[PDB]
Amino acid sequence: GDERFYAEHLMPTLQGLLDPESAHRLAVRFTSLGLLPRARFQDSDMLEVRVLGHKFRNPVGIAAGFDKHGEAVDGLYKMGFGFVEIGSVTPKPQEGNPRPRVFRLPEDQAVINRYGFNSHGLSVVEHRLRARQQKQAKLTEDGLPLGVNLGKNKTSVDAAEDYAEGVRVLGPLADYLVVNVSSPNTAGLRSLQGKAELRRLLTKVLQERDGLRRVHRPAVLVKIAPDLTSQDKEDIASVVKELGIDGLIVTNTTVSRPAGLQGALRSETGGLSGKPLRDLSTQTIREMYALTQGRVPIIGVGGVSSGQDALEKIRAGASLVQLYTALTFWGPPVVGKVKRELEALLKEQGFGGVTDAIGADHRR
Ligand SMILES: Cc1cc2nc3c(=O)[nH]c(=O)nc-3n(C[C@H](O)[C@H](O)[C@H](O)COP(=O)(O)O)c2cc1C
Ligand SMILES: O=Cc1ccccc1/C=N/Nc1nc(-c2ccccc2)cs1
Ligand SMILES: O=C(O)c1cc(=O)[nH]c(=O)[nH]1
């Protein structure tokens, strides 16, 4: 589990052999088999966070899109993540976009993807989660919660029914559900972020959620884009407070292409993730936290690869953070690296723990 060794030798060699999608499939396979160093970092109490009705023993999660179909959940906890989000999962199985559909931008430490919600579908994922449901219940009680990210099928007419089906089928197996209305890779999906569509969609989602038995009733979060207008953000904040939405995930990938991208593949269609997304995401967190008066838990995501990156999002208003793209460049040791650096920085800056740092920039 040598950070320098994975970063300098292992990851580049696998990247040099495999196209990104093959590398991803292989990584999911290795992870699901537990073929990783069991992370040696023991989580300090400073890293514990209580939010969303749960204890999280550390605030660093794996973002949706890595384990799309719920195959590697246990291997991901073994890697040291404090929580795992699987998905997005669509109601029916679907293949997603034609290949190639994932591209590396090594010079930018970025990735562009246009998977298009390739998904084994609700039924397959439901059976997969059911087979380990009681083990997850113990993990959750031990501070390692599970989130499920819901998508909608390409040919679906009623998006709200797609999401409602997801709540009914996977809601009982999740600590939190994410309504993903921000994928750049499904036509018309992001328009669900608009005020009228969003209110109607989320009213239905919450009704379905509230109809679940108490012990099987997940928190509901909305995952938003980094490309929203100020008007969009105000409207989302308003709907979230009107309806009692439990939290926000901020942010998905960007359809923008920031000035300065060097990668040859920078003009590929898709969502861009990684370092060029980092500060755009951080600023969106800052804005959403202010618009919700610090009362709505935020999971911050986008370009996190270090303790400093994590702490900047936490200070901007995130209670938890996730990463994905960094894992593809640095490998598994990046998880312990982020946690160890985060702990050191919290101590350097005079915080008793993560909880004290949440939103600290707003109180300056
Ligand atoms: C290859 C790939 C697939 C992704 N698939 C999903 C997805 O299915 N659902 C979702 O909500 N986000 C998905 N994401 C977005 C991540 O969850 C995250 O929001 C984004 O990548 C920014 O975080 P990062 O810079 O640490 O990668 C995907 C990202 C990548 C790179
Ligand atoms: O290579 C590009 C890429 C693009 C999209 C999604 C994943 C990847 C590659 N990921 N490579 C990873 N390898 C691991 C890994 C896991 C266990 C042992 C060694 C490496 C985790 S993520
Ligand atoms: O499946 C996708 O392509 C996908 C979904 C999503 O939510 N975000 C992303 O970058 N890609």
Curated annotation (Swiss-Prot):
Record function comment: Catalyzes the conversion of dihydroorotate to orotate with quinone as electron acceptor. Required for UMP biosynthesis via de novo pathway.
Entry coiled-coil feature ranges: none
A GO CC term assigned to this protein in UniProt: mitochondrion
Tagged with keyword Transmembrane: yes
Annotated residues for binding of substrate: K68, N113, R114, Y115, G116, F117, N180, V181, S182, S183, P184, N185, N252, T253
Disease tied to this protein: Postaxial acrofacial dysostosis: An autosomal recessive syndrome characterized by severe micrognathia, cleft lip and/or palate, hypoplasia or aplasia of the posterior elements of the limbs, coloboma of the eyelids and supernumerary nipples.
Keyword Acetylation: no
GO molecular function: dihydroorotase activity; dihydroorotate dehydrogenase (quinone) activity; dihydroorotate dehydrogenase activity
Entry superkingdom: Eukaryota
Keywords: Disease variant, Flavoprotein, FMN, Membrane, Mitochondrion, Mitochondrion inner membrane, Oxidoreductase, Pyrimidine biosynthesis, Transit peptide, Transmembrane, Transmembrane helix
Enzyme nomenclature, EC number: 1.3.5.2
Native source species: Homo sapiens
Gene: DHODH
Other remarks in the entry: The identification of DHODH defects as the cause of postaxial acrofacial dysostosis (POADS) was obtained via exome sequencing, demonstrating that this method is a powerful tool for identifying genes underlying rare Mendelian disorders. Exome sequencing consists of targeted resequencing of all protein-coding subsequences, which requires around 5% as much sequencing as a whole human genome.
Residue intervals annotated with topology Mitochondrial intermembrane: 1-364
Residues engaged in binding FMN: A64, G65, F66, D67, K68, S88, N149, N180, K223, T251, G274, G303, Y324, T325
Localization, UniProt: Mitochondrion inner membrane
Pfam families: DHO_dh (PF01180)
Family membership noted in the UniProt record: Belongs to the dihydroorotate dehydrogenase family. Type 2 subfamily.
UniProt subunit comment: Monomer.
Gene3D superfamilies: Aldolase class I
Catalysis performed (reactions): (S)-dihydroorotate + a quinone = orotate + a quinol
Active site: S183
Annotated pathway: Pyrimidine metabolism; UMP biosynthesis via de novo pathway; orotate from (S)-dihydroorotate (quinone route): step 1/1
PTM per Swiss-Prot/TrEMBL: The uncleaved transit peptide is required for mitochondrial targeting and proper membrane integration.
Protein name (database record): Dihydroorotate dehydrogenase (quinone), mitochondrial
InterPro entries tied to this protein: Aldolase_TIM, DHO_dehydrogenase, Dihydroorotate_DH_2, Dihydroorotate_DH_cat, Dihydroorotate_DH_CS
